[PDB]
Nucleic acid binder design. Structure first.
Lengths: 99, 93, 82, 108, 99, 82, 109, 95
DNA sequence: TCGGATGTATATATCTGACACGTGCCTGGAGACTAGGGAGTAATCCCCTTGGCGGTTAAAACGCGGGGGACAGCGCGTACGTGCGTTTAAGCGGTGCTAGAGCTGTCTACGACCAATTGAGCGGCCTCGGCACCGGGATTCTCGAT
DNA sequence: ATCGAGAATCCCGGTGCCGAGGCCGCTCAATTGGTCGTAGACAGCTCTAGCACCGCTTAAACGCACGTACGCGCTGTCCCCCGCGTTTTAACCGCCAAGGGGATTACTCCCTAGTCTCCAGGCACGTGTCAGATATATACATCCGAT
């Protein structure tokens, strides 16, 4: 029968691969469409510089990576290895975004 | 001898205008003075930055309006903008 | 560009963002949660960016508007001006 | 408004318009200061003061008092959802906290 | 045999009693001595206004009460009711004081 | 005042500060830990307060120095001036 | 030391003393600006720049490169203990993340 | 017609880089980041000095205000070394 | 389900000290005017934003088998809560002294301001060496088999 | 414990492009030199409030004993995420084209700074009295061992 890794090996391999790099991890066109949709419920007939959408993407990705680090800390605190929504909620509450 | 300025008599006028029968202690008035000073400096600093970004050298009333839109949360911002607009419109006319 | 683009933030993308954060295992309900926490964050920044754009009487959202909107929330960003 | 009296009375306010003008001119915020900026700022400051004072007066009446103390300002601020977002990083002296017990700790 | 409450009743009674009040909870002279000792390893022969020591005490007590709220949140997250040093450590790390 | 005054922040005082925070049960190793934390916080504020006092060429630490030192750390305090 | 030349050169710096003077003077910070404030500020800015650039150059040479990129600035900043405290709320674009795996997640015996 | 000119700190950052590492170059995005860093720190120090001169009812920002702002803003050893460097520069300029 | 026993809310007298209000006055705000440059407005140019094909192929979506991790339950034993008796030092009042904060007057050296001048720094060219990429081979974790 | 097969990642050499580094022309911002008015350095005086001491009452900290509820470790089930193969969708890249609106320049006018005079609002100080803190006595709610 063919080769097969055990659950948890490819996960660590991807952790190393993506902590070693600096690329952008969300696709560009879907994010640009999301940004335009939000902004157009704020004001109609707007235009965006490309640098503006790139800056928004950098900020969003940095935010989400920090939040996932804090979530992993909480999940380990509860003696687990799987992150769950209650970990995100506790991180955002202690951090100061849900008061 | 020196004299120090505060916002005590104006806070008291507002209080006797909204609650005609209650008074205010002294520590509460100290807290209210600190609140007024804090909000003044927040709004003024934001308006200064707004006038600097756009290469202007004058803080007009729309700098203050945009600073209020940036600093306060939603319905607070709406009511404060309406009050300020009404005050300026009554002042010029 | 009107309706339902938050599902363009796919599940592999959230999994990559979690791997860069050092996460080994992910629960199946995380994705619907992350598309919320993101949509709020974005909405706070754009709302400020547009507020700057209307002040300069412009109709184009410049990168400096985004840099100022982020600096105002305590998230200074280096590399796009400022 | 044509009446040439004190500017606070002309604009319709209780807060001082001239003192705010002087504080804006001598505070190193810009090189010039328009004529309608102190009026706007005085009106905004008066509105926010009236909001907080009304909530605090309600909180004081709810405790059978005829006088506001820092505890009532703390209660009025923490119990409003927007004044708590405007003053979330502020400490009121002699204010205490809001009564709050986590539901897991109560006897079952 | 004499009367006796069960463990957990007087604790809730004190929680209510101290959340209802606004007094200062640390003694004044010990805190003033601590403040003077720290400041005198920063600079010798200093004097303090009484308002200065009172402000320092208010700030310190507010800080510690907030930290204990966050610690209780962590302890409940781990499915406990007792707070431990690892809860304080997790709260101060997620909060931004231990990075 | 010279030596070992942090043991003057007794254990009952920490139980009271924890009860106001809503804590029902406390572990016997908390107290030590808490003292450590407290000291750090204090050392960050006083170090700034004295820095203001030296600038005005004074030998008395005023309450405004403490209010400024706290404001520059994101912990604004109402009721002592400013 | 007296001089008739550019002030940055008599002060001993490679940073504009006159431009910093004009920026302090036209920036609405105070009504007047002393003569020794731009010199001090230029010297402090040059020190901090030299510190960061040295650490980043070490990080670039540790990867067999002859050129600094944002990844090296990110590494040099996060791997110092004081530059990480001065720039703790800052995001470097295209900078990435320090490699760090929690010890509980690694495989065991 | 002409396009307006925009100033930056590129040539000075490059002089410092060629002083420290005599044979290393710098890319363009890294130089953008260095410009943002210099501007950020300038505005932090200048704003702190402005507030510090306003508290004491002064009209002038001197080297003493800048030194105290540096003592307030930077961490320990950074503060000690930056204060030594600024003092040495001002002394060399004056003498 | 239930009568103690303990703690907490409620009702009245009373007594002080802080809040609210009046008075003098002095300094900051208002009235009137002049002068100059900041900003509003019109016109023009050309950069860069948006919209549209068409192809290729990297990545997303879907289904499947199974192993490992989440979670519930049970048992033990140490550590924390509660209550009591003893010890310690905080808190309060009053006395007394002196350091140093705060204010006023004088004068001088420092920074703003203005006009002339000239070189440092910026925009545009452009070229070659560092870095990205291809591919082939070596090595090094990983895992099922004993 | 071990060894061998199979993916995965590092290493080494060759090929090529495009952006970093350096030159040049030129405009405008920094430098030089002089004048002037006022911010601040400094001396002197006053008098507030910070520090040190002393005695007394009693509230809170401390030490200790007992027991119970909770932390923590172990076991067992089961379901739900992970890894992998196959198919499908749409991102990405290069190109073409049009035009909106950002950016710059020229002109004018009207709005704000600056100066001087005048006067009344707000601040420091004094003083009376009533809201609130406290002592005391009940009344009621809550908790707990006993059924």
């Amino acid at each position: 029968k063919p080769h097969r890794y055990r659950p948890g090996t490819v996960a660590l391999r991807e952790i190393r691969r993506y902590q070693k790099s600096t690329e952008l991890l969300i696709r560009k066109l879907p994010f640009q469409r999301l940004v335009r949709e939000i902004a157009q419920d704020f004001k109609t007939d707007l235009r965006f510089q490309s640098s503006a959408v790139m800056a928004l993407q950098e900020a969003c990705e940095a935010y989400l990576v920090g939040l996932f680090e804090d979530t992993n800390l909480c999940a380990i605190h509860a003696k687990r290895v799987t992150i769950m929504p209650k970990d995100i909620q506790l991180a955002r509450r202690i951090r100061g975004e849900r008061a | 001898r020196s004299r120090k300025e505060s916002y005590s008599i104006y806070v008291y006028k507002v209080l006797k205008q909204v609650h005609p029968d209650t008074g205010i202690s002294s520590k509460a008035m100290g807290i209210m003075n600190s609140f007024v000073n804090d909000i003044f400096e927040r709004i003024a600093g934001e308006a200064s930055r707004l006038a600097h970004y756009n290469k202007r050298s004058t803080i007009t009333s729309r700098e203050i309006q945009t600073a209020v839109r940036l600093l306060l949360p939603g319905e607070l911002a709406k009511h404060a903008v309406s009050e300020g607009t009404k005050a300026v419109t009554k002042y010029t006319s | 560009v009107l309706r339902d683009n938050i599902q363009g933030i796919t599940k592999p993308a959230i999994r990559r963002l979690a791997r860069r954060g050092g996460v080994k295992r992910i629960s199946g309900l995380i994705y619907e949660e992350t598309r919320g926490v993101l949509k709020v964050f974005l909405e706070n920044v754009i709302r400020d960016a547009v507020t700057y754009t209307e002040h300069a009487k412009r109709k184009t959202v410049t990168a400096m508007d985004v840099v100022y909107a982020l600096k105002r929330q305590g998230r200074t960003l280096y590399g796009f001006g400022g | 408004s044509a009446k040439a009296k004190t500017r606070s009375s002309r604009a319709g306010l209780q807060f001082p318009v001239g003192r705010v003008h002087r504080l804006l001119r001598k505070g190193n915020y810009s090189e010039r200061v328009g004529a309608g900026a102190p009026v706007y700022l005085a009106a905004v400051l008066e509105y926010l003061t009236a909001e907080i004072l009304e909530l605090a007066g309600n909180a004081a009446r709810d405790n059978k008092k005829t006088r506001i103390i820092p505890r009532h300002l703390q209660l009025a601020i923490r119990n409003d959802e927007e004044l708590n977002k405007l003053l979330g990083r502020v400490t009121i002296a002699q204010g205490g906290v809001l009564p709050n017990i986590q539901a897991v700790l109560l006897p079952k």
